Symmetry: none
Subunit: 76 residues, 2 copies
């Protein structure tokens, strides 16, 4: 069954890789705005708080993958 | 051999669990700075930049673990 779970771990890891890269890109965008001085501090803060939330989510996804891999090792 | 490599992977997963907790703690800290609003967007962006780098590193290590478990499970 570990084969099923390992495939799941792989699929999910590929998804967070892709999701995290999108977050990085958004952060680049925010850096651009900051440098351009086109947004208010409040506006910038709002977008940064959203980045933080997205990263917390990605962190949790990795935690779950780790948990599953440990189950695999302990089972197989 | 395999039992050896399984112990290796588990040791690495233990480390990763610790790294995840650190990432989680740092994101909380960064969120708190956002609230104080005693910091610049550049400074906040720098700290988030570092979190992303750390997640990417974690991700690549998990990818490695999965590949080695692939080899074992393939055999099993």
């Amino acid at each position: 069954s570990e084969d099923y779970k390992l495939r799941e771990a792989q699929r999910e890891l590929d998804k967070q890789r892709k999701d995290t890269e999108e977050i990085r890109k958004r952060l680049k965008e925010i850096q651009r705005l900051t440098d351009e001085r086109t947004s208010t501090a409040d506006e910038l803060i709002k977008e940064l708080r959203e980045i933080i939330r997205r990263l917390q989510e990605q962190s949790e996804k990795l935690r779950e993958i780790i948990e599953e891999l440990e189950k695999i090792i302990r089972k197989r």
